[PDB]
C-alpha cells in the first residue's frame, strides 16, 4: 500500500586525490532504479531497474544535466563547509543528502523529506511543514540564510508535492509487477546445541520484499527482547531480503518458545516453533 521515493547523494572530498566525487542513487521503496557517479569513465545517469529503461532520451539527459550541475555545486559546498568549520585543507569530508516523498495506501502525499549531513552528523533539514529549516549549528545557519535567499524551501515544496509524487506514481505503475508486489518470507526454525543443557533456536525469514519485517521470540507468550540476538536485515542480491532472530534455550524447554513473523506479503502473521 504505502510507497516512497528517495534520492541519496554522497559528495566526498579527497585532498591530493583529485576533485570531490559526487554519487547519486534513486530508490522506490527498497528498489534502486538509477545511479550517477562523477568518477565513471563517462558520467551519465544509468538505469538500475528494468522498469525505468522505457524512459526516453530526454529523461536520461534531464537527469544527467541535474546530476552534473549537482557535482559542481557540491564541490563548492564542500569548500564552503570546510571554511565554516575552520577545517584544514588536508582532511577528507563528506556531505550527504537524502530527500523524497512518502505516499499513503491511497496514493496521497503523507509527507516530504529533505535532510543533509556533514561528516555523518545532521547539518540542515527541511521541517515537516516544507516551509522552514532546522539548522544544527552556527555553520548550518549560513547555509540556511543562503537557502532562504534562493527560496529553496518554496521550490522544494513545489517539487515534493508535485513532480516527486507524480513521478513516484508513474514508476509505481510502470514497475507494478515488482514494486507493488510484496513477497512473503519463507520461514523455518533451526536448532543448534551450545552445551549439554542449552541450545540455540534460530528463526529464519528468507526471500521477502520489502525489507520491513518484525521477527520476535516469545517464551510462554512473553517477548524475549533482551535475550534475542537479531541480525540486521540483509539483501539477498536478487531484490529480496533475509533476517534471523536467535534465542539460547535450556534443553527440553524448546516447546515453550515461539517465533512470530509479521510482513506485508503474508496473508496472516506466522507463529513458528522448532519441529524436531
Amino acid at each position: 500500500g504505502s510507497h516512497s521515493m528517495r534520492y541519496f547523494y554522497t559528495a566526498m572530498s579527497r585532498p591530493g586525490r583529485g576533485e570531490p566525487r559526487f554519487i547519486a542513487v534513486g530508490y522506490v521503496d527498497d528498489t534502486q532504479f538509477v545511479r550517477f557517479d562523477s568518477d565513471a569513465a563517462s558520467p551519465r545517469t544509468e538505469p538500475r531497474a528494468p522498469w525505468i529503461e522505457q524512459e526516453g532520451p530526454e529523461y536520461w539527459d534531464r537527469n544527467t544535466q541535474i546530476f552534473k550541475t549537482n557535482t559542481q555545486t557540491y564541490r563548492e559546498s564542500l569548500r564552503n563547509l570546510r571554511g565554516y568549520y575552520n577545517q584544514s585543507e588536508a582532511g577528507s569530508h563528506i556531505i550527504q543528502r537524502m530527500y523524497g516523498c512518502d505516499l499513503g495506501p491511497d496514493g496521497r502525499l503523507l509527507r516530504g523529506h529533505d535532510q543533509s549531513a556533514y561528516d555523518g552528523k545532521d547539518y540542515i533539514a527541511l521541517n515537516e511543514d516544507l516551509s522552514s529549516w532546522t539548522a544544527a549549528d552556527t555553520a548550518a545557519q549560513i547555509t540556511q540564510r543562503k537557502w532562504e535567499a534562493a527560496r529553496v524551501a518554496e521550490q522544494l515544496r513545489a517539487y515534493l508535492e508535485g513532480l516527486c509524487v507524480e513521478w513516484l506514481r508513474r514508476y509505481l505503475e510502470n514497475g507494478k509487477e515488482t514494486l507493488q508486489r510484496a513477497d512473503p518470507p519463507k520461514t523455518h526454525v533451526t536448532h543448534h546445541p551450545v552445551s549439554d543443557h542449552e541450545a540455540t533456536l534460530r528463526c529464519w525469514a528468507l526471500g521477502f520484499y520489502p525489507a520491513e519485517i518484525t521477527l520476535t521470540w516469545q517464551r510462554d507468550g512473553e517477548d524475549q527482547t533482551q535475550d534475542t540476538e537479531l541480525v540486521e536485515t540483509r539483501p539477498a542480491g536478487d531484490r529480496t531480503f533475509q533476517k534471523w532472530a536467535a534465542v539460547v534455550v535450556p534443553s527440553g524447554e524448546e516447546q515453550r518458545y515461539t517465533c512470530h513473523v509479521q510482513h506485508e506479503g503474508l496473508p496472516k502473521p506466522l507463529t513458528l516453533r522448532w519441529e524436531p
Binding site: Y7, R62, N63, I66, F67, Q72, T73, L81, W147, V152
Partner: peptide, 9 residues
C-alpha cells in the same frame, strides 16, 4: 525524477 535546483551551501 530528482529535484532540479542545485543550491550552493
Amino acid at each position: 525524477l530528482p529535484f532540479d535546483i542545485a543550491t550552493i551551501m
